[PDB]
């Protein structure tokens, strides 16, 4: 599943949660992938897709809200976008994700 793939990047890769750290990693060219929650505001989702196309980064959309995106990264708070800085030994880069 996609949630199995994210669970390895939290435990064996590098990442940033939240919006202001994500668009920072877009500006540095350090992002590999961004996963946006479903219930993000459309304007925030529109610039995160615009920051990706300026960096040729792939955008994945999570199938759920910010409460259940923060669950898949294994945290008790709610995250709106998770930005994969480094695929570890996981395979989110090489899959449809």
């Amino acid at each position: 599943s996609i949630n199995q793939k994210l669970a390895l990047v939290i435990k064996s890769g590098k990442y940033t949660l939240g919006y202001k750290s994500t668009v920072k990693s877009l500006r540095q060219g350090k992002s590999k992938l961004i996963i946006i929650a479903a219930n993000t505001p459309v304007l925030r989702k529109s610039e995160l897709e615009y920051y990706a196309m300026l960096s040729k980064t792939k955008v994945y959309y999570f199938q759920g809200g910010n409460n259940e995106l923060g669950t898949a990264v294994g945290k008790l708070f709610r995250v709106g976008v998770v930005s994969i800085l480094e695929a570890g030994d996981s395979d989110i880069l090489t899959t449809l994700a």
């Binding site: 219930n39 910010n66 709610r78």
Partner: protein, 91 residues
């Protein structure tokens, strides 16, 4: 501690009004004074302001809804009817 056995919120009415009338009030005053999940920001902040008006604290979006709960049982199936009827148009 547990302060009252069964009257709950309706213990403010005391001994008056008839017990079956204070039971139907307790079914709805729990619902209208509860906090509901916001659809938009995903926070549990939505409180009623007036009958049919449900405002969220942060992101400040005000959604119209039922008089004592956010989504009534009638209007939920309405939204899925019009969902069904619309996809018979685009297909």
């Amino acid at each position: 501690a547990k302060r009252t056995k069964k009257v709950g919120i309706t213990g403010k009415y005391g001994v008056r009004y008839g017990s079956s009338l204070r039971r139907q009030v307790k079914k709805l005053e729990i619902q209208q004074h509860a906090r509901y999940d916001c659809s938009f920001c995903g926070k549990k902040t939505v409180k009623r302001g007036a009958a049919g008006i449900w405002t969220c604290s942060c992101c400040k979006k005000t959604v119209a809804g039922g008089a004592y709960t956010v989504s009534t049982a009638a209007a939920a199936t309405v939204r899925s009817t019009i969902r069904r009827l619309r996809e018979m148009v685009e297909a």
